[PDB]
Amino acid sequence: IDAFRLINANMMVLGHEPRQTTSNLGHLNKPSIQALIHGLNRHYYSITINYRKNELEQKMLLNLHKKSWMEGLTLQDYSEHCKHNESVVKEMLELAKNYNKAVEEEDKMTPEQLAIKNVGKQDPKRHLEEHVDVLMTSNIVQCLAAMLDTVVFK
Amino acid sequence: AVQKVVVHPLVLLSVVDHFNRIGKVGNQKRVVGVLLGSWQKKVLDVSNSFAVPFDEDDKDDSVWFLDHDYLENMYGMFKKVNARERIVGWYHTGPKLHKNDIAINELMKRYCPNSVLVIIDVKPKDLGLPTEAYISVEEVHDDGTPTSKTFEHVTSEIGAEEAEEVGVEHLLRDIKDTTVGTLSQRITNQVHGLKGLNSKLLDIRSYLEKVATGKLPINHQIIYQLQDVFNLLPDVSLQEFVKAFYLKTNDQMVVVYLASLIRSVVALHNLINNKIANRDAEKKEG
Amino acid sequence: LLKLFTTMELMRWSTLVEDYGMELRKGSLESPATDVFGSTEEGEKRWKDLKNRVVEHNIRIMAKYYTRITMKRMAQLLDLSVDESEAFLSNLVVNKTIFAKVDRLAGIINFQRPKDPNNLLNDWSQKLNSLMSLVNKTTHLIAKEEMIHNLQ
Amino acid sequence: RPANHRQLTFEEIAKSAKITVNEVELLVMKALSVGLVKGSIDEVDKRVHMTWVQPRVLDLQQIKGMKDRLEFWCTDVKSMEMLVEHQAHDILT
Amino acid sequence: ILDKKFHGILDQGEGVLIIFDEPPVDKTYEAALETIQNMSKVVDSLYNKAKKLT
Amino acid sequence: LLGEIPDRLQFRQPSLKRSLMPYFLLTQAVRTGNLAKFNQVLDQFGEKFQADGTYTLIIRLRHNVIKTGVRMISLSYSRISLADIAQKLQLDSPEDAEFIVAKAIRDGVIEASINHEKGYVQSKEMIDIYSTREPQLAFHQRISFCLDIHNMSVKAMRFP
Amino acid sequence: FLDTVSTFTSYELMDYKTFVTYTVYVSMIALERPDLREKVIKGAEILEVLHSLPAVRQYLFSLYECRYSVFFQSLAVVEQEMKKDWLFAPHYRYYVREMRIHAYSQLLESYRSLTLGYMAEAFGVGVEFIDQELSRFIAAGRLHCKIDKVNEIVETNRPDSKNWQYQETIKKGDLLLNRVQKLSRVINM
């Protein structure tokens, strides 16, 4: 948000330093970087910015962005997921099964080579297990398959 | 026609602050303003909006005011600062639409060829999706109505923009239960049942209400039509709709064996690493 | 000729003769009927090709509006032999532009229920069946909205 | 007929319409050509399958059946949704 | 029939041949080749088990 | 005493053959439909039974043996005569083949229908209420067990 | 044993001909027919040396000819040698029923209206032996086809691809879950 305030040059005979409610200055020095901001603490002293929010506005922005990311009438996209679960999912299920064969026959080399090299030293090379993400996609498969009974019946 | 309209958060907050503008006069005033956007495609885009003077009294309740000159000079300002931006329509507060809510569009059809409206709600008691949008078409009837000029809704949502993402997603800081995965959708899974229920409650209330009042309202065309559409598609048959359930068994099958095989192995491998680093640091510590 | 077009409106080749046999003699032009019937080898070719086109004209809605059909009704709706019917559906199934199974040892044959053990018979039936209701939902919502705010 | 077990055979057509056997197929394919029926035909039993009915003007018993069956659907949807919500509510939390 | 050129079944008292087919058997490969390898996974982990025990 | 039975010597030891083989011959007798092999083993190793304190097998295991035999032969023959299966399973009489197969239906083993005029027991086959119901119940057990593996794995991993 | 071309006359290949006998005595089990004719019948380098011995070519052209009575003659010779031969000692028993079911498959595939009245003349004798053998092999969860008593009917189930679909997955998950039970409870004492 970043706001500023200009200082004069006539009042450098006098001081510049009453700074009431000291917390604001020590808060100003933390959001902060540079050599040139450090060179522009002269001619500039900032000022704290804060935020007050209408609970009406907060709650209707919550309406918008926790309700309107769900879509209209709210059944519509979940029944569309139910449309996915019998026509499109089996193709990415084939992709999942091919990944969970091909990645697996080389990630069974991994505890072998853990026993081989050392007790757990530095990163040897490229690949990893990465199975957890593919399993989470399979969890998406099962949850939207659970959606089928709920939506389709009644 | 229109595919759907894409409303951004800035215009909705630009309605809320407008209600805050005219909330001090209080007495009898709805919120009415002018919509700005961009005709992108069959889909519609909305970027900005602003105010308009408007009032409406009690006796002979067809008294309504749209300043053309305000529109002229302030659209000159907004066109002067942004030439990408131009008019697309208007809006108002929308508790619902009343009878006088056609004359605004019938004024400013000479500005936008399809002057689209937006109905919002400043009071978020709506557990549905706000920012309703209509569009006026004609549907001239079998009964020989001369011209029925009726607003019809085209669907709407809240869209995204990179800077307004920074804005909104910083202005919340409030609630995040999602951990997006198997459970970012279950809150909305309660919502889809409950918000079919609210709409159906409006349906049964309307059906009971048409018999009592409206004198014989009952919708006269689109009651029997869309009611028989309802009465033509609740498929509860039992010949092979039972036989979708070995495909349901197949849906269960893949995830069962993926979970049962790989989940246990990964957690076991992590147990291996934990107990190796447990006992081999235990023999060095103690 | 336009009655020949829309939804087949079931047409009979003998009635086609009864309404079309005047083109060889009457009227004033007769020259496309000279291109049909004048050259007698082209006359024969267009006799048999008119036969082929009327049986092809049969077979479209014979596929559309028959989950099954009997072989005898095929015989009495093509006005030709059972074996000529089998030959027409044989080369129009090696055409495979109409799926068929002319099970002739009982006459009960079936059209356009191709195999269907698959997902789709429940899948897309069920899901169009539900989501057409879901998309008509909002339309009758705004329809009732309009007709309550027309008069209230 | 209440639109559930409604696959009609040749007999009641030839009884109502009082036309002979080999004309009911013309009779149904005429309506299929027009589009005031959206069904299909088997002919081992001459069962003309019904996946269609005409939207008809709402009468008093139609008013009552509308409200009653609409409530019948509504309370079932509500009663099952409440059980889903309460069964998986505390894991939403 | 024997050369898999054809999917039929014969009759002797009737002389009737009948054609029928059901192609997809992807589930068997789909899960079995996972499980056959995960056998070797756990057999690889046997050594780490014997190392942590003794 | 169930009806499903594993091969026991999957954990056989070189210090075990003495104490497995009569008992393995017993389960060898049970894993066929015969009962004349079964009845000899009681009089054979009843002293072994006196040692092992397991007399209760012999009063009721004949029931499971004949259920296994009738299950096997009912899966074999589509349409069987009672006056053949009875003498094939030494029942000595055809009239209680009605009784034994009638409680192979009453006890829920077999579905097979009988004309009790000619004495033939025809059996039919079906699927797909299998596939609608049967596997998913087992998968529920499999995943309840593997998620319990996951639960115990994490809650014993978290000591460091 | 696919190669049989550059398999040097060795000490363990103490006869290249014995290598040929082994590679036919396992290829008559392994695949059904989608390379079987092409390798051992349409091939030539194997064909000359199987043309050398009579007994090798005997069972090949028998089973490919489906001579349903000389099968156990050929199998009697090969099996009595299989008794007195090493590295088949826990193996020859399941071998025989394997050949039996592999012949019964290609028999029962063509016909659905067949019975013991077709067996007695084209297969051999002892109708009760056919009865008990097919009874045990069908009730062994193998080669699904249903047999009738004195009405003299052996009917087949035309697809056997409903539960074999479901089969091997549960049959491997059993052993893998039984593995991970004990081996996961090995840690933490």
UniProtKB/Swiss-Prot annotation, chain B:
<comment type="similarity">
    <text>Belongs to the peptidase M67A family.</text>
</comment>
<keyword id="KW-0832">Ubl conjugation</keyword>
<dbReference type="GO" id="GO:0005576">
    <property type="term" value="C:extracellular region"/>
</dbReference>
<feature type="cross-link" description="Glycyl lysine isopeptide (Lys-Gly) (interchain with G-Cter in ubiquitin)">
    <location>
        <position position="176"/>
    </location>
</feature>
<dbReference type="GO" id="GO:0070062">
    <property type="term" value="C:extracellular exosome"/>
</dbReference>
<dbReference type="InterPro" id="IPR000555">
    <property type="entry name" value="JAMM/MPN+_dom"/>
</dbReference>
<dbReference type="GO" id="GO:0000502">
    <property type="term" value="C:proteasome complex"/>
</dbReference>
<dbReference type="GO" id="GO:0042803">
    <property type="term" value="F:protein homodimerization activity"/>
</dbReference>
<dbReference type="InterPro" id="IPR037518">
    <property type="entry name" value="MPN"/>
</dbReference>
<feature type="modified residue" description="N6-acetyllysine">
    <location>
        <position position="200"/>
    </location>
</feature>
<protein>
    <recommendedName>
        <fullName>26S proteasome non-ATPase regulatory subunit 7</fullName>
    </recommendedName>
</protein>
<dbReference type="GO" id="GO:0005838">
    <property type="term" value="C:proteasome regulatory particle"/>
</dbReference>
Curated annotation (Swiss-Prot), chain D:
<comment type="function">
    <text>Component of the 26S proteasome, a multiprotein complex involved in the ATP-dependent degradation of ubiquitinated proteins. This complex plays a key role in the maintenance of protein homeostasis by removing misfolded or damaged proteins, which could impair cellular functions, and by removing proteins whose functions are no longer required. Therefore, the proteasome participates in numerous cellular processes, including cell cycle progression, apoptosis, or DNA damage repair.</text>
</comment>
<feature type="modified residue" description="N6-acetyllysine">
    <location>
        <position position="15"/>
    </location>
</feature>
<comment type="similarity">
    <text>Belongs to the proteasome subunit S11 family.</text>
</comment>
<comment type="subunit">
    <text>Component of the 19S proteasome regulatory particle complex. The 26S proteasome consists of a 20S core particle (CP) and two 19S regulatory subunits (RP). The regulatory particle is made of a lid composed of 9 subunits including PSMD13, a base containing 6 ATPases and few additional components.</text>
</comment>
<protein>
    <recommendedName>
        <fullName>26S proteasome non-ATPase regulatory subunit 13</fullName>
    </recommendedName>
</protein>
Curated annotation (Swiss-Prot), chain E:
<comment type="similarity">
    <text>Belongs to the proteasome subunit S9 family.</text>
</comment>
<comment type="subunit">
    <text>Component of the 19S proteasome regulatory particle complex. The 26S proteasome consists of a 20S core particle (CP) and two 19S regulatory subunits (RP). The regulatory particle is made of a lid composed of 9 subunits including PSMD11, a base containing 6 ATPases and few additional components.</text>
</comment>
<comment type="function">
    <text>Component of the 26S proteasome, a multiprotein complex involved in the ATP-dependent degradation of ubiquitinated proteins. This complex plays a key role in the maintenance of protein homeostasis by removing misfolded or damaged proteins, which could impair cellular functions, and by removing proteins whose functions are no longer required. Therefore, the proteasome participates in numerous cellular processes, including cell cycle progression, apoptosis, or DNA damage repair. In the complex, PSMD11 is required for proteasome assembly.</text>
</comment>
<protein>
    <recommendedName>
        <fullName>26S proteasome non-ATPase regulatory subunit 11</fullName>
    </recommendedName>
</protein>
Curated annotation (Swiss-Prot), chain F:
<comment type="subunit">
    <text>Component of the 19S proteasome regulatory particle complex. The 26S proteasome consists of a 20S core particle (CP) and two 19S regulatory subunits (RP). The regulatory particle is made of a lid composed of 9 subunits including PSMD3, a base containing 6 ATPases and few additional components. Interacts with UBQLN1 (via ubiquitin-like domain). Interacts with ERCC6.</text>
</comment>
<protein>
    <recommendedName>
        <fullName>26S proteasome non-ATPase regulatory subunit 3</fullName>
    </recommendedName>
</protein>
<feature type="domain" description="PCI">
    <location>
        <begin position="1"/>
        <end position="128"/>
    </location>
</feature>
<comment type="function">
    <text>Component of the 26S proteasome, a multiprotein complex involved in the ATP-dependent degradation of ubiquitinated proteins. This complex plays a key role in the maintenance of protein homeostasis by removing misfolded or damaged proteins, which could impair cellular functions, and by removing proteins whose functions are no longer required. Therefore, the proteasome participates in numerous cellular processes, including cell cycle progression, apoptosis, or DNA damage repair.</text>
</comment>
<comment type="similarity">
    <text>Belongs to the proteasome subunit S3 family.</text>
</comment>
<feature type="modified residue" description="Phosphoserine">
    <location>
        <position position="93"/>
    </location>
</feature>
<feature type="modified residue" description="Phosphoserine">
    <location>
        <position position="81"/>
    </location>
</feature>
